[PDB]
Design a protein around this ligand. Structure first.
Ligand code: CLA
Ligand code: CLA
Ligand code: CLA
Ligand code: CLA
Ligand code: CLA
Ligand code: CLA
Ligand code: CLA
Ligand SMILES: CCCCCCCCCCCCCCCC(=O)OC[C@H](COP(=O)(O)OC[C@@H](O)CO)OC(=O)CCCCCCCCCCCCCCC
Ligand SMILES: CC1=CCCC(C)(C)[C@H]1/C=C/C(C)=C/C=C/C(C)=C/C=C/C=C(C)/C=C/C=C(C)/C=C/C1=C(C)CCCC1(C)C
Ligand SMILES: CC1=CCCC(C)(C)[C@H]1/C=C/C(C)=C/C=C/C(C)=C/C=C/C=C(C)/C=C/C=C(C)/C=C/C1=C(C)CCCC1(C)C
Ligand SMILES: CC1=C(C/C=C(\C)CCC[C@H](C)CCC[C@H](C)CCCC(C)C)C(=O)c2ccccc2C1=O
Ligand code: SF4
Ligand code: SF4
Lengths: 60, 80, 108, 107, 732, 139, 161
C-alpha cells in the first residue's frame, strides 16, 4: 500500500477486521508489522490505531 | 503459577512493565518493532493475575496475555 | 485505620452471634411449631424471653408524672403505659406492651 | 410473618381492582416487576452483554444502520448501580402499595 | 496435599480452594492429568455400570419400602379411597402431635403419603401383593450387583475394551435399536399379554403358573396362521371392573382407542399392541447398519452423500462422521437434547393419555409427576446446549470441518443470534404488553376492553382430532371426511368418546388465557435458546475475547480492561440460561397446575377470566392456593401438611441465600476473611488450633455455581411444597 | 549487595495490618530506601509512618506490598533508591528488585526474553488439535 | 359463530357485564345530590360505559362464555379490523420510524463530527427526514434493489469464528 490510502483489515482477531482504516505510515526497516493504520471507530480499549503487516491489509 | 505470554505484535511501549504491581515483566532487546524492545515475563511465579498489564497494552489484541493457572500463596495474593 | 482488623473482626463476630441468636430463635420456633412441640418454643406461653429492661423503662416513664417529672400532669407518651386515648371511637394511642415477640424482633 | 402478616394483609392490594385503590394494585404488580427486572442487572456480567450487542451491531451493519456512538454494555459499576436502583425502586414500591392500600381500606 | 490426585495444579494449592475445586472437577475425566483416550472411554464405561446400579438400587428401595411399610394390599382393594404410602417415618425430633398427624394411610405409625404414582404403575403392570413387590426388590438388588460386578470386570486388564470397540457406531446402533429398544419393547409386550392383562382380568399369572396358562384361549395358533385379528376379538367390556373377572374379555391385541371407562386409563390391550408394533418396527430399524455380513449401511457413507447439489449447505455433512465420533460432548449434547424432548413428551402425554389405572384421579400424583418431568426436561435441555458449547471450545476442529454444516453455522452466528434476539424481544414486548394492557384495563373497572385473542389455530388442531367443541367441523370432527371414515373401523369410535367427554385432560378446552400463556412460554423458550446458542456460538471467540477458546469453558473473566469482561465465558451463558430455564418451567407448571386445579374443582371459568391479567395469577392462583400450605402449622396446631409448610419456608430461605452469592462478589469477602485470619492468630487459647488450608473466599466462578445451586434448590423445594400441599389441601 | 540487617526502621507506632505467622514460617519481604528527609509516608498495611533521614528498612508479607510502597516513595518523594528483598526463615536473603540494577521498564543487555511467542495471538492452535497430545497451543 | 363464540350483541353474559358495570356506578351516584360535581362526574361515566357496550355489541365482535369480547386473528376478512388492519397501520408507522431513523444515521456519517450529530440533532435536517417517511415502502425497496440497503458480508466486522 502507500501512506494515506484506505485499507480493509484482514487480521481476524482485529477489532476492525473487515473494516476500513487509513494508512498513516509504513516503516522501511525490518519491522514485523510495518503498516500503521488509523480508524474512526475506537476498539473496546478505546484505541483508534494499530500496526499491521502487508499480508493483513488490502487497498479498497 | 500463572502463565504470561508476549506475542510479536508488541510495539515496545513498556506500559505493561510499568503497570505490573509485582515486577513480573521487563524489557528485553528486540529488532521486530520500531522501539527495539519487547516485553518479557521472567518472573511469572510472582504473577498475581491482576491483568493490569493487559489493560495497559495498546495493541489491537493484547500482545501480553495472562493465563490464570494453578494457584499458590504468591498468586493468590495471600499475606497470611 | 491502624487497628481496623480488630474493629472489623469484632463487628464480624457480633453479627454472627446476633444472627444466630436473633434469627435462629425464629428458626427454632418454626421447627418446634412444625414438629408439634409448642412447649419447646421461645414464647410468652412457653420458654419466655422477656424484655425486662424495656418493660422496666416503660414502668419508669409511667411513674414519672408527679414523681421524677413532678410538674408534668401526664406521661410523655401513652405508649409507655397509662390510658387509652380514643378519638372518634378510634384509638389515638394506648400502651404498647412488649413480650417475647418484641424481644425477638428488637434483636432482629 | 408470612401467613398472618404478608399473606393476610396483602388481601386489600390484590382485591383492589375496580376500586379507587386499583392504582395501588397496579403499583404492587409494577414494583414486583421492577424488582425482578433488577436481578437481570445484579446476577449478570458485562461480558455477556457486550457479546450479545456485537450480534445486534452486526444486523445493523448488515442494513447500514449502525450508530456512530458505538453501543456498549453498561460498565461493571453501572450494572451494579442499575441493579441496585431498580431493586430499591421495586422492593420499596411493593411495600408502599401494600402499606397504603392495606391501611386505607382498614384504618 | 493429595486429595485432587487427578490434578497436580489443585493438589499444590495451599488454600481451601483445593477442596472445593477438587470436588467440582472430579467427573471431568478429560481434564485430569495424564488422561489418554483409552482410559477416558474405559472409566466412562465402568461409571456407566455404576450409574446403572444406582438406578436399580433406587428402584429396589422404593419397592422394598412399600412392601415393608406401605399399604399396597389395602390400596389395591380400594384404590380411589386409600392414599398410597411411600415409607414410614422415624424422626426423634417429632412431638406427639406430629406423630398423630402423620399416622394416616390406615396404619398405626407415622408415614409419608406417596406422590410418585408407583402404586398405580405397579398395580397396572400386574403387582397385587406385597410378596411380589418384595420379589421385584430382590431382583433389582441382584441386578445392581450384576452391574456393579460388570463395571469392575470391564476395568480388568483383559476385559478393558479397545477404542476400536467404543467407536463401532454401526454395531452399537444395530444392537441398541433392535435389542435395547426393540426387543425389550417386544418383551414388555409379552409381559402385558402374559401377566398384566390376565391379572387385570382376575387371573393370577406368575412364574409358578405362566408356562401352563395361555394368554389367549386359541393360543399362539392364530399367530402362526395369519389370523392375527382373532386376537382382537372380545375386548374388555365397558362394564369391566379392573382386577376382577367381571366384564372381562379375552382379547390381547386391540386398537380400541380411548380410555377404560372405570380406570380412566388406556386399555391394557392397546398398550400391549403398541409395544408389539413399536418393537417390530425398532427391530427392523436395528438391521440398517453394516456390521460383519455385508448388508447394511455405512454411517460415514450416508453423511458424506448428503450434500444438496444446489450448494446451499456448502460441503454438507462431509466430516461430520469423524466430528461426532471423536467428540463425546457432541454425543452427549445430541443425547441430552433428544432426552430432553422425550421427558417433555412424557410429561405432556402422561397427563392427557394416562396408562395407569385410577391415576388422573390422584390429583397430587398427576401434578407432581408433570412438574417433576418438565423440570427434568429443562435441565436436560440446558445440558445439551452446555455440552454443545463444551464441544466447540474443546472438541471442534475447524480444519477437519471445512465448509460443513457445523462451520457454516459459525460463519453466520451473528445472523442466528440477532434473529433470536429479535424474536425474543418481539414476543416479549407484545406478550407482556397485552398482559399489562389487560391488567390496567381490568383495574380501571373495564374488563371488556381487554385484548382477548382466541387461540383458533390450536382449537382447529383440536377439532382436527375430533373435538366437537368449537364447531370447526374439520377432518375427524367432520362426520363425512376421508380422515374420519378411514379410522372408523378401529380407534375413531373410542377416541371420539374420549376427546368429546369433558371428564379427562385429552385436548383440554382453550381460550384467551391459554393463548397468552403459550406466547409467554414461546418467549421463554426463545430467550433460553438465545443465551445458550449465544454461549455455544461465541464459545470459541468473540470480539471482546477473540482467543476465548485458549482459556477453556469456565473461566471467571478476562479482567476489567476493554470495558469489563464479567460473565464472558461460555460457562457463564449456561449460568444465565439456568435462570431462564427455571422461569420457563415455572410458567409451564404454573399454567398446568392452575388450569388443572380449577377444572378439578368444577370451576374452569375461574381460570378463563383471571388468566388474562397478571393479578389473576397472583391472587387466584398463588395467594388463593397458598392458604392450606401456610396453615400446615399455626399457633392453633399442626396437621400433616406441616412438612410441606416447612419445606415452603425452607425453599424461600435457600433461594434468598443464593442472592448473596449472586449479588455480592469476591473482593468484599476476601477482605473480611483477612480480618478473621488476623483475629484467630491473635486470640489466646484459640491460636493453639491452626488451619491446614489457608481460609480464602470462594472463587469467582465457584460463587456463581454456589448461588445458582441455592437459587435452583430454593426454586424446586418451594414449588414442590406448593404444588403438593395446595393440591392435597384442596383435593381438586 | 546483601541486606544489612542493622538498617534502622521508619518510626511507626504499629498496626494490625502487618505480617502474620506465614511471614515467620514461609517468607518475608523487605524494602530499603534512602530518604533525604525525616518525612511522613503512608504504610501499605495501614496508617502513616515517618521515614528517617538516611537509610530505612521495612518488612512486609507480600511482594506487592513492598512495590506498592516503592511506587508511592518514587511518585511523591522521588526516591528511586529502593531495593526489595525476599527473606526465607532459613536466613537466606534473596534480592528481588530491581533485579539487575536497572529498572524493568528500561532495557538492559544480558536480559534474556522469557515468554515470547513468535507469532501473533490469533495464530495459536485450537484445543481440539492438541487434545490427548502434550503439544503446546502457542504453535 | 367462529370457534363456538357468540356475537356480543346477543351474548347474555355481555348484557350482564353492562348492567353490573352500571349498577356499580349508580350505587356510587346514590350518595350524591343532583347538581353536585361528583354527581355529574358519575353521570358522565354511566353515559361512557353504556356507549362503549353499545358500540362493541354492534361492531361484529364475538363474546365468550365470560361475556368479554374475543379477537379472531387467523386472517379471515370478516375479522380483519381486529388484527390485520391495526397491524397494517402499525407496520406503516414502524417502517416510517425505521426508514427515517436510518436516513438520519447515514446523513450523520458524512458530518464534520458524526457523533455530535447524534447527541445534538440537526433538527431542520432531521425534520426533512421525518417528512420523507410517508413513502418508505417504495423508497426502501428501491433502496434494496439498487444495492444500497444491504451491505455485502465482506464489509462487516465479525468475530474470528
Ligand atoms: C436469606 C438470605 C441470606 C442469608 C441467610 C444470609 C446470611 C448471612 N449474610 Mg448475607 N446477603 C444476602 C442474603 C442472605 N445472607 C443478600 C441477598 C445479600 C446481597 C447484598 C447479602 C450480602 C451480605 C453481606 C455484604 C454481608 C452478609 C452477611 C451475612 C451473615 C450475617 C451474619 C449472621 O447472621 O450469621 C449467622 C448466620 C445465619 C443467620 C445464617 C442462617 C443460619 C441459621 C441460624 C440456621 C443454621 C442452621 C445450622 C447451621 C444447621 C447445621 C446442620 C446442617 C449443616 C445439616 C450471614 C452469613 C455479613 C457477614 O458475613 O458478616 C458477618 C456481610 O458482611 N450478607
Ligand atoms: C442387544 C444388545 C445390547 C443391549 C441390550 C445393550 C444395552 C445397553 N448398553 Mg450397549 N452395546 C452393545 C449391545 C447391547 N447393549 C454392543 C454390541 C456394543 C458394542 C458395539 C455396545 C456398547 C455400549 C457402550 C459403549 C455403552 C453401552 C451402554 C448400554 C446401556 C445403556 C444405558 C441404559 O440402561 O439405557 C437403557 C435404555 C433403554 C431401556 C431404552 C431407552 C428408552 C428411551 C429413552 C425411552 C423409553 C420410554 C419408555 C416409555 C420407558 C418407560 C419406563 C417405565 C418407568 C414406564 C444398556 C444397558 C452404555 C452403558 O451404560 O454401559 C453400562 C455404554 O456406555 N453399550
Ligand atoms: C448424562 C448426563 C451428563 C453427563 C455425563 C455430564 C458429564 C459432565 N458434565 Mg454435564 N451437564 C448435564 C448432564 C451431564 N453432564 C446437565 C443436565 C447439565 C445442566 C445442569 C450439565 C451442565 C454442565 C456444565 C455447565 C458443566 C458440565 C460438566 C460436565 C463434566 C464434569 C462434571 C463434574 O466434574 O462435576 C462433578 C461434580 C461433583 C462430583 C460434585 C457433586 C462431565 C464431562 C462441566 C465440565 O467440566 O465441562 C467442561 C461443566 O462445566 N455439565
Ligand atoms: C422480570 C424480570 C425480567 C425481565 C422483564 C427481563 C427482561 C428481559 N431479559 Mg432478562 N433476566 C432476568 C429477569 C428479567 N429479564 C434475570 C433474573 C436474569 C438472570 C440474570 C436475566 C437474564 C437475562 C439474559 C442473560 C438475557 C435476558 C434477556 C431478556 C430480554 C428477554 C425478553 C425480550 O427479549 O423482550 C422483552 C422486553 C422487555 C420485557 C422490555 C420491557 C419494555 C419496557 C418496560 C418499556 C417501558 C418503557 C418505559 C417508558 C420506561 C420507563 C422508565 C422511566 C424512568 C421513565 C428482556 C429485555 C435476553 C436479551 O436481552 O435478549 C434480547 C438475554 O440474553 N435476561
Ligand atoms: C414470532 C412470533 C410468534 C411466535 C413464536 C408464536 C408462537 C406460537 N403461537 Mg402465535 N401468533 C403470532 C406470533 C407468534 N406466535 C402473531 C403475530 C399472531 C397473530 C395475532 C399469532 C396468533 C396465534 C394464534 C391464533 C395461535 C398462536 C399459537 C401459537 C403457538 C403454536 C404455534 C403457532 O400457531 O404459531 C403461530 C405462528 C405464526 C402466526 C407465525 C408468525 C410469524 C410472523 C413472522 C410473526 C409476525 C407477523 C406479523 C406481525 C403480521 C404481518 C402483518 C399483518 C397484520 C398484515 C406458539 C406458542 C396457537 C396456540 O397454541 O395458542 C394457544 C394459536 O392458536 N398464535
Ligand atoms: C397458522 C398459520 C396460518 C397462516 C399463516 C394464515 C394466513 C392467512 N389466513 Mg388464516 N387460518 C389459519 C391459519 C393460518 N392462516 C387457521 C388454522 C384457520 C382456521 C381454519 C384459518 C382461517 C382463515 C380464514 C377463514 C381465512 C384465512 C385467511 C388468511 C390469509 C389472509 C391474509 C391476507 O391478507 O392474504 C390474502 C390477501 C392478500 C395477499 C392481499 C390482500 C390485500 C392469510 C394468508 C383468509 C384468506 O384470504 O384465505 C386465503 C380467510 O378468509 N384464514
Ligand atoms: C430508527 C433507528 C433504528 C433502526 C432502523 C433499527 C433497525 C433495527 N434494529 Mg434497532 N435499535 C435502535 C434504533 C434502530 N434500529 C436503538 C435506538 C436501539 C437502542 C434501544 C436499538 C436496539 C436494538 C436491539 C437490541 C435490537 C435491534 C434490532 C434491530 C433490527 C430489527 C428491528 C427491531 O428489532 O427493532 C427493534 C427496535 C428497538 C428494540 C428499539 C428501537 C427504539 C426506537 C423506536 C428507534 C430509535 C428512533 C431514533 C431516535 C430515530 C430518530 C430519527 C430522527 C433523528 C430523524 C433492525 C436492524 C434487533 C436485531 O438485531 O434483530 C435482527 C435487536 O435485537 N435494535
Ligand atoms: C422435521 C425436520 C425439520 C427440518 C428443518 C430444518 C431447517 C430447514 C431446512 C431447510 C429446508 C428449506 C430450505 C430448502 C428448500 C427447498 O425445498 O430446496 C429445494 C431446492 C434446493 O434443494 P437441492 O439443492 O436439493 O436442489 C437442487 C437444485 O438446486 C439443483 O438440482 O431449491 C431449488 O433450487 C429447487 C426449487 C424447488 C423445486 C420446485 C419445487 C416446487 C415449486 C412449486 C410448488 C407448487 C407451487 C404452486 C402451488 C402453490
Ligand atoms: C456414588 C458411588 C461412588 C463411586 C462410584 C460408584 C461405586 C459407582 C458409586 C456407587 C455407589 C453404590 C452403588 C453404593 C451402594 C451402596 C449400598 C448397596 C450399600 C448397602 C449397604 C447395606 C448394608 C450395610 C446392610 C448390611 C446388612 C447386614 C450387615 C446384615 C447381616 C446379617 C443379618 C442381620 C441377617 C443375615 C446374617 C447376617 C450376615 C448376620
Ligand atoms: C449447541 C450445540 C452446538 C453444536 C453441537 C450440538 C450439541 C448439536 C448443539 C446442540 C443443539 C441442541 C441442544 C439442539 C436441540 C434441538 C431440538 C430440541 C430440536 C427439536 C426438534 C423437534 C422437531 C424437529 C419436531 C418435529 C415434529 C414434527 C415434524 C411433527 C409433525 C406432525 C406430526 C408427525 C403429527 C402432528 C401433525 C404434524 C405437526 C404435521
Ligand atoms: C440488560 C443488561 C445490559 C444491557 C443494557 C443496556 C446496554 C442499556 C439499555 C438501556 C437503553 C439503551 C436505554 C434505557 C431506556 C429505558 C427504557 C428507560 C431508562 C430510564 C432512564 C435511563 C431514563 C448491560 O449492559 C449490563 C452490564 C453489566 C451488568 C448487567 C447488565 C444487564 O443486565
Ligand atoms: S497479571 Fe498482574 S502481576 Fe501478572 S504480569 Fe500482568 S500486571 Fe503483572
Ligand atoms: S504493553 Fe503491550 S505493546 Fe507495550 S510493551 Fe507491553 S506487551 Fe508490548
Amino acid at each position: 500500500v502507500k501512506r494515506g490510502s484506505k485499507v480493509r483489515i484482514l487480521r481476524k482477531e482485529s477489532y476492525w477486521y473487515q473494516d476500513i482504516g487509513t494508512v498513516a505510515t509504513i516503516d522501511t526497516s525490518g519491522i514485523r508489522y510495518p503498516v500503521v493504520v488509523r480508524f474512526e471507530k475506537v476498539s473496546y480499549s478505546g484505541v483508534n490505531t494499530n500496526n499491521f503487516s502487508l499480508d493483513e491489509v488490502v487497498e479498497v | 503459577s500463572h502463565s504470561v505470554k508476549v506475542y510479536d505484535t508488541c510495539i515496545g511501549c513498556t506500559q505493561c512493565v510499568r503497570a505490573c504491581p509485582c515486577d513480573v515483566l521487563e524489557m528485553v532487546s528486540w529488532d521486530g518493532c520500531k522501539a527495539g524492545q519487547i516485553a518479557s515475563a521472567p518472573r511469572t511465579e510472582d504473577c498475581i493475575g491482576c491483568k493490569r498489564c493487559e489493560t495497559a497494552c495498546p495493541t489491537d489484541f493484547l500482545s501480553v496475555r495472562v493465563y490464570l493457572g494453578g494457584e499458590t500463596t504468591r498468586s493468590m495474593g495471600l499475606a497470611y | 485505620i491502624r487497628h481496623r482488623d480488630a474493629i472489623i473482626s469484632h463487628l464480624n463476630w457480633i453479627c454472627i452471634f446476633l444472627g444466630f441468636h436473633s434469627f435462629g430463635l425464629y428458626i427454632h420456633n418454626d421447627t418446634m411449631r412444625a414438629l408439634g412441640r409448642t412447649q419447646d418454643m421461645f414464647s410468652d406461653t412457653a420458654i419466655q424471653l422477656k424484655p425486662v429492661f424495656a418493660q422496666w423503662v416503660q414502668s419508669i416513664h409511667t411513674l414519672a408524672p408527679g414523681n421524677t417529672t413532678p410538674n408534668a400532669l401526664a406521661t410523655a407518651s401513652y405508649a409507655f403505659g397509662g390510658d387509652v386515648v380514643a378519638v372518634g371511637n378510634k384509638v389515638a394511642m394506648m400502651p404498647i406492651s412488649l413480650g417475647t415477640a418484641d424481644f425477638m424482633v428488637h434483636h432482629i | 410473618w408470612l401467613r398472618d402478616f404478608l399473606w393476610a394483609q396483602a388481601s386489600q392490594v390484590i382485591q383492589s381492582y375496580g376500586s379507587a385503590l386499583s392504582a395501588y394494585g397496579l403499583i404492587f404488580l409494577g414494583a414486583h416487576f421492577i424488582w425482578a427486572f433488577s436481578l437481570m442487572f445484579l446476577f449478570s456480567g458485562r461480558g455477556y452483554w457486550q457479546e450479545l450487542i456485537e450480534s445486534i451491531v452486526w444486523a445493523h451493519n448488515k442494513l447500514n444502520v449502525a450508530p456512530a456512538i458505538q453501543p456498549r454494555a453498561l460498565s461493571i459499576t453501572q450494572g451494579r448501580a442499575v441493579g441496585l436502583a431498580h431493586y430499591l425502586l421495586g422492593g420499596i414500591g411493593t411495600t408502599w402499595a401494600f402499606f397504603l392500600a392495606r391501611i386505607i381500606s382498614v384504618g | 496435599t493429595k486429595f485432587p490426585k487427578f490434578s497436580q495444579a489443585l493438589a499444590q494449592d495451599p488454600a481451601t480452594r483445593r477442596i472445593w475445586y477438587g470436588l467440582a472437577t472430579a467427573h471431568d475425566l478429560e481434564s485430569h492429568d495424564g488422561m489418554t483416550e483409552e482410559n477416558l472411554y474405559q472409566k466412562i464405561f465402568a461409571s456407566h455400570f455404576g450409574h446403572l446400579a444406582v438406578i436399580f438400587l433406587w428402584t429396589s428401595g422404593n419397592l422394598f419400602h412399600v412392601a415393608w411399610q406401605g399399604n399396597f394390599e389395602q390400596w389395591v382393594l380400594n384404590p380411589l379411597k386409600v392414599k398410597p404410602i411411600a415409607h414410614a417415618i422415624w424422626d426423634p425430633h417429632f412431638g406427639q402431635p406430629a406423630v398423630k398427624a402423620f399416622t394416616k394411610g390406615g396404619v398405626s405409625y407415622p408415614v409419608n403419603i406417596a406422590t410418585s404414582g408407583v402404586y398405580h404403575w405397579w398395580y397396572t403392570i400386574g403387582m397385587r401383593s406385597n410378596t411380589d413387590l418384595y420379589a421385584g426388590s430382590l431382583f433389582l438388588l441382584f441386578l445392581a450387583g450384576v452391574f456393579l460386578f460388570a463395571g469392575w470386570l470391564h476395568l480388568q486388564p483383559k476385559f478393558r475394551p479397545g477404542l476400536s470397540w467404543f467407536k463401532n457406531n454401526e454395531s452399537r446402533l444395530n444392537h441398541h435399536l433392535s435389542g435395547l429398544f426393540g426387543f425389550s419393547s417386544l418383551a414388555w409386550s409379552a409381559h402385558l399379554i402374559h401377566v398384566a392383562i390376565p391379572e387385570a382380568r382376575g387371573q393370577h399369572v406368575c412364574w409358578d403358573n405362566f408356562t401352563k396358562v395361555a394368554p389367549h384361549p386359541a393360543g399362539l395358533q392364530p399367530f402362526f396362521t395369519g389370523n392375527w385379528g382373532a386376537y382382537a376379538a372380545s375386548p374388555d367390556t365397558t362394564n369391566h371392573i379392573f382386577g376382577t373377572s367381571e366384564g372381562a374379555g379375552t382379547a390381547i391385541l386391540t386398537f380400541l382407542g380411548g380410555f377404560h371407562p372405570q380406570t380412566q386409563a388406556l386399555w391394557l390391550t392397546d398398550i400391549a399392541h403398541h409395544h408389539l408394533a413399536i418393537g417390530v418396527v425398532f427391530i427392523f430399524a436395528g438391521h440398517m447398519y453394516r456390521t460383519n455380513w455385508g448388508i447394511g449401511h455405512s454411517l460415514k457413507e450416508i453423511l458424506d452423500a448428503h450434500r444438496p447439489p444446489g450448494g446451499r449447505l456448502g460441503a454438507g455433512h462431509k466430516g461430520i462422521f469423524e466430528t461426532l465420533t471423536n467428540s463425546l460432548h457432541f454425543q452427549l449434547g445430541l443425547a441430552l437434547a433428544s432426552l430432553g424432548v422425550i421427558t417433555s413428551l412424557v410429561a405432556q402425554h402422561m397427563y392427557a393419555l394416562p396408562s395407569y389405572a385410577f391415576i388422573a384421579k390422584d390429583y397430587v400424583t398427576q401434578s407432581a409427576l408433570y412438574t417433576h418431568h418438565q423440570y427434568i426436561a429443562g435441565f436436560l435441555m440446558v445440558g445439551a446446549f452446555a455440552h454443545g458449547a463444551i464441544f466447540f471450545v474443546r472438541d471442534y476442529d475447524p480444519e477437519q470441518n471445512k465448509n460443513n454444516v457445523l462451520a457454516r453455522i459459525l460463519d453466520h452466528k451473528e445472523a442466528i443470534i440477532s434473529h433470536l434476539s429479535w424474536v425474543s424481544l418481539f414476543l416479549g414486548f407484545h406478550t407482556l404488553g397485552i398482559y399489562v394492557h389487560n391488567d390496567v384495563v381490568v383495574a380501571f373497572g373495564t374488563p371488556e376492553k381487554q385484548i382477548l385473542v382466541e387461540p383458533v389455530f390450536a382449537q382447529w388442531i383440536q377439532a382436527s382430532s375430533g373435538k366437537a367443541l368449537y364447531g370447526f367441523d374439520v377432518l375427524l370432527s367432520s362426520t363425512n371426511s376421508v380422515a374420519a371414515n378411514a379410522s372408523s373401523n378401529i380407534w375413531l369410535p373410542g377416541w371420539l368418546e374420549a376427546i368429546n367427554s369433558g371428564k379427562n385432560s385429552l385436548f383440554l378446552p382453550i381460550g384467551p388465557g391459554d393463548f397468552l400463556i403459550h406466547h409467554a412460554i414461546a418467549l421463554a423458550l426463545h430467550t433460553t435458546t438465545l443465551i445458550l446458542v449465544k454461549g455455544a456460538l461465541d464459545a470459541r471467540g468473540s470480539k471482546l475475547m477473540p482467543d476465548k477458546k485458549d482459556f477453556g469453558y469456565a473461566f471467571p473473566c478476562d479482567g476489567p480492561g476493554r470495558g469489563g469482561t464479567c460473565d464472558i465465558s461460555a460457562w457463564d451463558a449456561f449460568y444465565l440460561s439456568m435462570f431462564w430455564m427455571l422461569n420457563t418451567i415455572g410458567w409451564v407448571t404454573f399454567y398446568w397446575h392452575w388450569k388443572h386445579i380449577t377444572i378439578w374443582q368444577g370451576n374452569a371459568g375461574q381460570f378463563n377470566e383471571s388468566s388474562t391479567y397478571i393479578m389473576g395469577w397472583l391472587r387466584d392462583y398463588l395467594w388463593l392456593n397458598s392458604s392450606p400450605l401456610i396453615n400446615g402449622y399455626n399457633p392453633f396446631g399442626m396437621n400433616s401438611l406441616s412438612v410441606w409448610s416447612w419445606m415452603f419456608l425452607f425453599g424461600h430461605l435457600i433461594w434468598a441465600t443464593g442472592f448473596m452469592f449472586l449479588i455480592s462478589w469476591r473482593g468484599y469477602w476476601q477482605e473480611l476473611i483477612e480480618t478473621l485470619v488476623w483475629a484467630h492468630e491473635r486470640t489466646p487459647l484459640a491460636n493453639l488450633v491452626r488451619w491446614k488450608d489457608k481460609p480464602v473466599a470462594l472463587s469467582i466462578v465457584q460463587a456463581r455455581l454456589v448461588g445458582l445451586i441455592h437459587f435452583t434448590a430454593g426454586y424446586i423445594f418451594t414449588y414442590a411444597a406448593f404444588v403438593i400441599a395446595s393440591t392435597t389441601g384442596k383435593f381438586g | 549487595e546483601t541486606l544489612n540487617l542493622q538498617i534502622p526502621s521508619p518510626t511507626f507506632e504499629g498496626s494490625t495490618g502487618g505480617w502474620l505467622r506465614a511471614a515467620e514460617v514461609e517468607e518475608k519481604y523487605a524494602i530499603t530506601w534512602t530518604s533525604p528527609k525525616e518525612q511522613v509516608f503512608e504504610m501499605p498495611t495501614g496508617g502513616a509512618a515517618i521515614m528517617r533521614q538516611g537509610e530505612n528498612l521495612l518488612y512486609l508479607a507480600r511482594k506487592e506490598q513492598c512495590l506498592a510502597l516503592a511506587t508511592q516513595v518514587k511518585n511523591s518523594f522521588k526516591i528511586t533508591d529502593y531495593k526489595v528483598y525476599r527473606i526465607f526463615p532459613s536466613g537466606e536473603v534473596q534480592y528481588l528488585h530491581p533485579k539487575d540494577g536497572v529498572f524493568p521498564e528500561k532495557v538492559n543487555a544480558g536480559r534474556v526474553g522469557v515468554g515470547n511467542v513468535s507469532h501473533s495471538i490469533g495464530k495459536n492452535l485450537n484445543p481440539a488439535q492438541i487434545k490427548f497430545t502434550s503439544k503446546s497451543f502457542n504453535g | 359463530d367462529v370457534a363456538g363464540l357468540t356475537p356480543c350483541g346477543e351474548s347474555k353474559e355481555f348484557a350482564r357485564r353492562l348492567d353490573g358495570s352500571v349498577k356499580k356506578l349508580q350505587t356510587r351516584l346514590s350518595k350524591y345530590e343532583a347538581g353536585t360535581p361528583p354527581a355529574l362526574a358519575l353521570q358522565k361515566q354511566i353515559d361512557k360505559t353504556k356507549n362503549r357496550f353499545d358500540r362493541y355489541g354492534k361492531a361484529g365482535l364475538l363474546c365468550g362464555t365470560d361475556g368479554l369480547p374475543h379477537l379472531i386473528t387467523d386472517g379471515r376478512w370478516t375479522h380483519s379490523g381486529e388484527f390485520v388492519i391495526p397491524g397494517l397501520l402499525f407496520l406503516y408507522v414502524a417502517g416510517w420510524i425505521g426508514w427515517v431513523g436510518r436516513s438520519y444515521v447515514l446523513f450523520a456519517r458524512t458530518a464534520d463530527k458524526p457523533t455530535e450529530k447524534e447527541i445534538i440533532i440537526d433538527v431542520p435536517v432531521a425534520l426533512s427526514f421525518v417528512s420523507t417517511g410517508f413513502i418508505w415502502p417504495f423508497s426502501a425497496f428501491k433502496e434494496f434493489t439498487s444495492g444500497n440497503l444491504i451491505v455485502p458480508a465482506d464489509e462487516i466486522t465479525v468475530s474470528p469464528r
